[PDB]
């Protein structure tokens, strides 16, 4: 432990900002003595041998709240000469030696990404995201954060880069695959609302490659359909939904999930006279499904969950509502 | 060795630690944690655990909300008691005595023991308020928490009236009611200290039936043993002994 000699540099670096704040009338001298003592205690806690990511986050939160307090006080005392750049630089320094000391803590990596995104640092955010993905490649949350922020920026090629490396790594759970199909169809909806893409064959290709993965269950394909069924206002949405249903019917013929997609298929983009027409079609499918030879307890639990989802909406007729209740109660 | 006697009195009257081993030992003295863990604990960890304890205590009883502002404050994480003046130390002593009178009823509970552990590990109540802390733990003298408080108490910081506890500090066993009652019949100071503690609580209406039954039993047995001591057969000595018994009793019974 050379921690005193190690923290001497960070205190001597933070000193001239305190000299500027003392030569302005923004912080008084007793308050600056308090800032000196608090930063000194924080540095000698941070550079200690036995340290913790919560200790690094407490120091980050204190420095960031000091920047916010000085911003409020500077706007109140009407000064424009004092800048926040030194505080952002030292907060980046705290975070860089934080991710040096504890690279295996995703809470601290995500706090670093939240800070770098919040003070408008996109290129630095991309570099931090690359380092975090290299250290935690099995983390679907980090991969979806990278891909969704690249899609939110609009660099769809970079979003596909992050997502295809993520689906190359995370193949135990379906989560990142579902989020990639969600992002690709959101790109398809953006390409539609801007008015290949005319076919929209990429989620069908995602399904065809996902057919051979170690998570490939009927529940996983039902999760694929439950992702796909949102935002039906598209062009090839019926093509995608019909391909999912014929894949599940050709592969898992008598599963309750396949009977559930047989129930809930024809209600794609409905909200309105086309609503109860397709509801009567789906209820015919549902009654045939309930009488048919399938695990009725599993199919009934699926249908009462979907019927709670149905009952969550207003603006319907009471006869339809009470016949949903009557068909619910005997399950 | 008159110089060694003067320096021994100076070292016993001193309060703040002045070398690193003394600071580590005085920080190691705790109620809950073992010493090997309690050395390496900053005042944010202790404040988090003991503020969870005080949140439970403040949800149990309503009247802990001023101590939420003055004793268990996030600023009271940082205050060193040995760096404030005599009037700040006296007002802090008044606040601590009020909290101990308030917390004496719930002291078998782990929230209240966590709150007392915060007072002990931050404000050093076992060194600076040994009288009120030892008196508020005296009605619970049959419990392991009293055994631990007896373990962490400094020896020369105990008042003279509670110096019967020294064999129970040398061998960590809880003292019996026979020992407390016998020292109450022998010393008037211990009986006056117990009665003064419970009357100072009962004037602030922070009584509880454990404390009331404790004081009633020990003053009953102490007046019993005191009469059996005061009886002499000689007329003038029994007159003077009845007068001394009434002068030692009269304020307590005239208020209670």
């Amino acid at each position: 432990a050379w921690v005193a000699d190690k923290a001497r540099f960070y205190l001597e670096r933070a000193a001239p900002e305190l000299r500027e704040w003392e030569e302005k009338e923004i912080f008084t001298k007793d308050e600056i003595r308090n800032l000196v003592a608090k930063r000194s205690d924080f540095e000698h806690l941070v550079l200690a041998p036995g340290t913790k990511p919560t200790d690094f986050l407490n120091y980050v939160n204190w420095e960031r709240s000091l920047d916010r307090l000085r911003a409020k006080r500077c706007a109140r005392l009407n000064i424009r000469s004092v800048t926040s750049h030194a505080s952002q630089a030292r907060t980046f320094g705290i975070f860089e030696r934080a991710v040096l000391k504890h690279p295996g803590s995703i809470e601290l990596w995500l706090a670093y990404l939240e800070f770098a995104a919040q003070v408008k640092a996109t290129k630095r955010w991309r570099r931090i995201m690359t380092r975090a993905l290299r250290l935690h490649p099995m983390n679907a949350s980090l991969w979806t954060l990278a891909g969704r922020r690249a899609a939110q920026n609009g660099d769809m090629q970079r979003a596909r880069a992050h997502f295809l490396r993520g689906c190359r790594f995370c193949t135990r759970e379906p989560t990142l695959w579902l989020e990639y199909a969600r992002c690709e169809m959101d790109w398809l909806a953006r390409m539609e609302a801007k008015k290949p893409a005319l076919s929209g064959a990429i989620p069908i290709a995602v399904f065809d490659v996902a057919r051979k993965q170690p998570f490939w269950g009927p529940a996983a394909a039902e999760k694929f359909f439950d992702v796909f069924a949102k935002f039906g206002h598209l062009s090839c949405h019926e093509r995608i939904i019909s391909h999912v249903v014929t894949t599940m019917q050709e592969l898992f013929p008598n599963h309750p999930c396949t009977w559930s997609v047989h129930i809930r298929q024809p209600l794609v983009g409905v909200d309105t006279p086309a609503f109860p027409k397709a509801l009567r079609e789906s209820l015919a499918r549902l009654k045939a499904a309930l009488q048919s030879t399938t695990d009725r307890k599993a199919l009934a639990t699926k249908m009462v969950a979907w019927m709670d989802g149905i009952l969550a909406i207003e603006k319907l007729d009471a006869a339809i509502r009470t016949v949903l209740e009557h068909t619910k109660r005997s399950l | 060795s008159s110089l060694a006697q003067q320096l021994a009195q100076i070292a016993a009257n001193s309060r703040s630690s002045f070398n690193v081993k003394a600071l580590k030992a005085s920080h190691s003295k705790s109620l809950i944690w073992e010493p090997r863990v309690a050395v390496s604990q900053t005042f944010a960890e202790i404040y988090s655990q003991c503020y969870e304890g005080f949140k439970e205590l403040c949800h149990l009883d309503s009247r802990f909300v001023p101590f939420d502002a003055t004793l268990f404050s996030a600023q009271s994480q940082e205050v060193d008691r040995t760096q404030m003046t005599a009037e700040e130390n006296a007002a802090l002593d008044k606040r601590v005595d009020s909290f101990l009178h308030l917390v004496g009823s719930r002291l078998r509970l782990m929230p209240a023991i966590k709150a007392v552990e915060w007072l002990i590990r931050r404000f050093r109540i076992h060194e600076f308020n040994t009288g009120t802390l030892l008196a508020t733990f005296l009605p619970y003298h049959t419990i392991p928490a009293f055994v631990t408080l007896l373990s962490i108490l400094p020896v020369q910081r105990i008042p003279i009236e509670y110096r019967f506890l020294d064999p129970y500090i040398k061998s960590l066993t809880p003292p019996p009611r026979a020992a407390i009652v016998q020292q109450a019949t022998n010393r008037p100071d211990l009986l006056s200290a117990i009665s003064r503690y419970t009357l100072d609580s009962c004037r602030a209406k922070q009584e509880y039936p454990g404390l009331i039954s404790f004081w009633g039993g020990i003053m009953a047995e102490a007046v019993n043993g005191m009469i059996d001591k005061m009886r002499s057969g000689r007329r003038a000595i029994q007159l003077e002994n009845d007068h001394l018994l009434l002068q030692q009793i009269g304020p307590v019974l005239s208020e209670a």
């Binding site: 307090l69 409020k72 | 996030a74 205050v79 700040e88």
Partner: peptide
């Protein structure tokens, strides 16, 4: 007052609250 409540909360968190601790003592 000329100070926001969020500014006073940041002042009590960042800078310390020693003066109001002494004020809460002497009551």
């Amino acid at each position: 007052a000329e100070k926001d409540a969020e500014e006073e909360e940041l002042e009590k968190f960042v800078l310390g609250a020693k003066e109001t601790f002494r004020e809460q003592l002497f009551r």
